[PDB]
Amino acid sequence: RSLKKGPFIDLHLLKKVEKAVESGDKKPLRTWSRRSTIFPNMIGLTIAVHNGRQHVPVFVTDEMVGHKLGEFAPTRTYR
Amino acid sequence: NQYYGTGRRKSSAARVFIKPGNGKIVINQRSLEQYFGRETARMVVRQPLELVDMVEKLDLYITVKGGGISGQAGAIRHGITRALMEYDESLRSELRKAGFVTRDARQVERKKVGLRKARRRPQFSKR
Amino acid sequence: PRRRVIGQRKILPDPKFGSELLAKFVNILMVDGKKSTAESIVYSALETLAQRSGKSELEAFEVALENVRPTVEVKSRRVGGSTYQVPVEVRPVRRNALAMRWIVEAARKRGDKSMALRLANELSDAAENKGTAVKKREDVHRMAEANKAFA
Amino acid sequence: RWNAVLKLQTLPRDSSPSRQRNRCRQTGRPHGFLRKFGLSRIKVREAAMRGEIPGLKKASW
Amino acid sequence: RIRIRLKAFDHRLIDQATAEIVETAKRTGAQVRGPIPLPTRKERFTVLISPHVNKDARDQYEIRTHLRLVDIVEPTEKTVDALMRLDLAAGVDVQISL
Amino acid sequence: ARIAGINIPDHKHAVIALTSIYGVGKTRSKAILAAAGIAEDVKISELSEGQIDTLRDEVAKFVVEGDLRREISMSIKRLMDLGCYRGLRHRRGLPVRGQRTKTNARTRKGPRKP
RNA sequence: AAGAACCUUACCUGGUCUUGACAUCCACGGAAGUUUUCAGAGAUGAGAAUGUGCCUUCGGGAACCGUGAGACAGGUGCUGC
RNA sequence: CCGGCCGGGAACUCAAAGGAGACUGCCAGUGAUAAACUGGAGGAAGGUGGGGAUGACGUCAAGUCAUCAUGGCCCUUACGACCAGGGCUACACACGUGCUACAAUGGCGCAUACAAAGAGAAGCGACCUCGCGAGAGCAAGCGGACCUCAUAAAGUGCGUCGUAGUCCGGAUUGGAGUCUGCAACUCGACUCCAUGAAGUCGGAAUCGCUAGUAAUCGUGGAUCAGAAUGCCACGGUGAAUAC
Incomplete structure (x- = not known):
């Protein structure tokens, strides 16, 4: 898609991810960052991605390699 | 010998030279006709070689820069009428009646704050 | 205007063809500063007019214009009661202006091809005196004198 | 991209021209900041009219 | 050859420095070209006047940058130093390259 | 003829005929006609049948028509079922590409509603 | 408003501090500073390294940092009637 | 090497320093003879030459306590300070101010050609090579009448399209890419391929403009990491009508 030759991911979250990868899934992790672009290693693991007032529960699945954390999170309430 | 005439219009610098002879029209070392002189200032610059005499009595050498079509023409026009003086400038007195001894002074008016162009004013809600 | 006089410059005569009247016609016709596309249109229209009619060059558009020149125009005016339309006798200059003026709007309104052709066709049905320009001329004569003496 | 080197984003993000x-x-x-004096327009005007800024004057082109 | 390109707010000021380089040069040695004029740089600004709102009227400002170029084709090397240095160049900026 | 696509592009010049098929625009039309060796000016229907049969082979190479429609619809529906914002923006019927909605969503939102 | 992705940005939900982000002022200890780490979303707290310098009158002092004290600092808060 | 290129000429252009000229002055007529006016003369410029700068006494207890200063009032372990993410860009709507269209004086294709004003060192970045292009790698020259951005477009010459929601028009949306930055996720620009809504010229009503103007096509700057259809600046083409 876009953003040139390879995306960015968050360092502090990556060390928590290696616990989630090695030990397997446990619970939604409460993360302030939305910034990371998902790649295969985050798949099958419960995380939670901030919307500016709460971490939104994303369980990661197969095609999410195409996506960032942030995309599933709603920052503007509606009727 | 040579008869020189300068002139300007709209910041276009020209340099006209005249001597006797069955002249073709030479502009920047190419013909004006090979500069599309069917269209480019087509009879416009050959104004002193209209009213007071015919074309084929003077050889002519011209070098012009700046302007577009009408921009290029008037510097050469006012240089060529001034350069028309093989035996004196007596024909300027007849060209005075025609008005081609006086170049058109006019220039573009600047942009100023609060106008769309130069006199064009914006529209404004109610009154 | 109310006070100080206006009397503008008398424009360039058209190159070779020699009609300063047709030079003024292209200056009225001119779209958006394109004097170049205007001069491109006029000769193509003038050749197609003279080719169709079988006539000579200068008098072809001139005879077409001559029928469509009325001697009067009307003005909206009021002094007492609600608005009146008042006929007045045209200036001879403004006469030739008004004939040319209605032509360009008429040429836009035709069912025809591109502009050289459609303008020559408009001149054709003013030379034949049966089209839109004669219809626009043949109005004011009826309207006058129902309304004569107001200023 | 390359290895550990792209991961070096432990910078303060006060580095950036952003x-x-x-x-x-x-x-x-x-x-209202023009770079040439490095001031917002009003203190530029306040100085300039009071003749302090050297070589600066009104324009009438 | 050796040349001075000058820069100035005032045209009548850079004029005195390029007067002084001439009369210094033909005094101490010879061979100066005087002031080649060169086109003027004009820094034209426009800025908004009001502390708040009122876009409509603004004030225009200008800084005229007068340049001059002086060359010496002078080969008298041991009077070139006497031409050099000593001048204060009319209180406005000058640069002297070879 | 239908030229292996399902559209018939009758009585056009060949570049216009090739743009008329779904999934082929002016750029792809230029590449297909240059590949087949077929001049743009010629009327498409009029040309000899083996030169049509050449185009009938050539147009089939790129993915076109209802095949390209259903592929696009499947990626939209798939993303829409993910519950992504850009996905949900499909389901809600409002600007996906971040255009303003205070004014000017009038194409995608549609006719004015009471 | 001559430039809202963070910063900008003032506001919100969150995480924090309260002589503070910045002044003026004392004491006491420490060169300033250049390296690296764990825990944290970061601010940050909590580290190990190292360095330990121009004036000196041998109680120092200026550059400058950290801690603490009280006088205080601060406010795009309010009032353009 | 017949390219202003290299002697040279500095004539001449341009530039920028300094100056001249136009003052109702020259004449006639008209006008209370005066003031003034009309017309003509001569003259490159004639009746305030054109533009710009330049804004009377005073009006709206106008606007601005958020540029700043500041009387008074208030909070001062919170209305202060620091930091992360979010918001300021939402959307059944209404309006203002702009851009782009609805085309044939035009679209689309090839060839061909005159500018004017700028800006530039954590910059601008040729040239050269590489890439579908956006762009990428290597990299001179110049703090600028030199070098760079930078190859001005409308226009003009030929050819195609022919009245159609079109070889018009671009919305929307898909897929695949490039560029900046700690960061493109809410929330960037830009490229490529594909898709091809609305619109076939807009009600009542209303705005601007008297000459290099209106109109129309390009270029540039400030702002600036990246940010424009805005604003600010420059020129090209260039009118109509004013009883």
Whole structure:
């Protein structure tokens, strides 16, 4: 898609991810960052991605390699 | 010998030279006709070689820069009428009646704050 | 205007063809500063007019214009009661202006091809005196004198 | 991209040219700043008309 | 050859420095070209007047940058130093390259 | 003829005929006709049948028509079922590409509603 | 407002501090500073390294940092009637 | 090497320093003879030459306590300060101010050609090579009448399209890419391929403009990491009508 030759991911979250990868899934992790672009290693693991007032529960699945954390999170309430 | 005439219009610098002879029209070392002189200032610059005499009595050498079509023409026009003086400038007195001894002074008016162009004013809600 | 006089410059005569009247016609016709596309249109229209009619060059558009020149125009005016339309006798200059003026709007309104052709066709049905320009001329004569003496 | 080197984003993000604003040097205003004096327009005018700024004058072109 | 390109707010001021380089040069040695004029740089600004709102009227400003160029084709090397240095160049900026 | 696509592009010049098929625009039309060796000016229907049969082979190479429609619809529906914002923006019927909605969503939102 | 992705940005939900982000002022200890780490979303707290310098009158002092004290600092807060 | 290129000429252009000229002055007529006016003369410029700068006494207890200063009032372990993410860009709507269209004086294709004003060192970045292009790698020259951005477009010459929601028009949306930055996720620009809504010229009503103007096509700057259809600046083409 876009953003040139390879995306960015968050360092502090990556060390928590290696616990989630090695030990397997446990619970939604409460993360302030939305910034990371998902790649295969985050798949099958419960995380939670901030919307500016709460971490939104994303369980990661197969095609999410195409996506960032942030995309599933709603920052503007509606009727 | 040579008869020189300068002139300007709209910041276009020209340099006209005249001597006797069955002249073709030479502009920047190419013909004006090979500069599309069917269209480019087509009879416009050959104004002193209209009213007071015919074309084929003077050889002519011209070098012009700046302007577009009408921009290029008037510097050469006012240089060529001034350069028309093989035996004196007596024909300027007849060209005075025609008005081609006086170049058109006019220039573009600047942009100023609060106008769309130069006199064009914006529209404004109610009154 | 109310006070100080206006009397503008008398424009360039058209190159070779020699009609300063047709030079003024292209200056009225001119779209958006394109004097170049205007001069491109006029000769193509003038050749197609003279080719169709079988006539000579200068008098072809001139005879077409001559029928469509009325001697009067009307003005909206009021002094007492609600608005009146008042006929007045045209200036001879403004006469030739008004004939040319209605032509360009008429040429836009035709069912025809591109502009050289459609303008020559408009001149054709003013030379034949049966089209839109004669219809626009043949109005004011009826309207006058129902309304004569107001200023 | 490459290895550990792209992961070196432990920087303060105060490094970036995306970060510093270029506020008005005298007043802190973050709007109306021309770089040439490095001030917002009003303190430029306040100085210029009071003749302090060298070689500066009105324009009438 | 050796040349001075000058820069100035005032045209009548850079004029005195390029007067002084001439009369210094033909005094101490010879061979100066005087002031080649060169086109003027004009820094034209426009800025908004009001503290708040009122976009409509603004004030225009200008800084005229007068340049001059002086060359010496002078080969008298041991009077070139006497031409050099000593001048204060009319209180406005000058640069002297070879 | 239908030229292996399902559209018939009758009585056009060949570049216009090739743009008329779904999934082929002016750029792809230029590449297909240059590949087949077929001049743009010629009327498409009029040309000899083996030169049509050449185009009938050539147009089939790129993915076109209802095949390209259903592929696009499947990626939209798939993303929409993910519950992504850009996905949900499909389901809600409002600007996906971040255009303003205070004014000017009038194409995608549609006719004015009471 | 001559430039809202963070910063900008003032506001919100969150995480924090309270002589503070910045002045003026004392004491006491420490060169300033250049390296690296764990825990944290970061601010940050909590580290190990190292360095330990121009004036000196041998109680120092200026550049400058950290801690603590009280006088205080601060406010795009309010009032353009 | 017949390219202003290289002697040279500095004539001449341009530039920028300094100056001249136009003052109702020259004449006639008209006008209370005066003031003034009309017309003509001569003259490159004639009746305030054109533009710009330049804004009377005073009006709206106008606007601005958020540029700043500041009387008074208030909070001062919170209305202060620091920091992360979010918001300021929402959307059944209404309006203002702009851009782009609805085309044939035009679209689309090839060839061909005159500018004017700028800006530039954590910059601008040729040239050269590489890439579908956006762009990428290597990299001179110049703090600028030199070098760079930078190859001005409308226009003009030929050819195609022919009245159609079109070889018009671009919305929307898909897929695949490039560029900046700690960061493109809410929330960037830009490229490529594909898709091809609305619109076939807009009600009542209303705005601007008297000459290099209106109109129309390009270029540039400030702002600036990246940010424009805005604003600010420049020129090209260039009118109509004013009883």
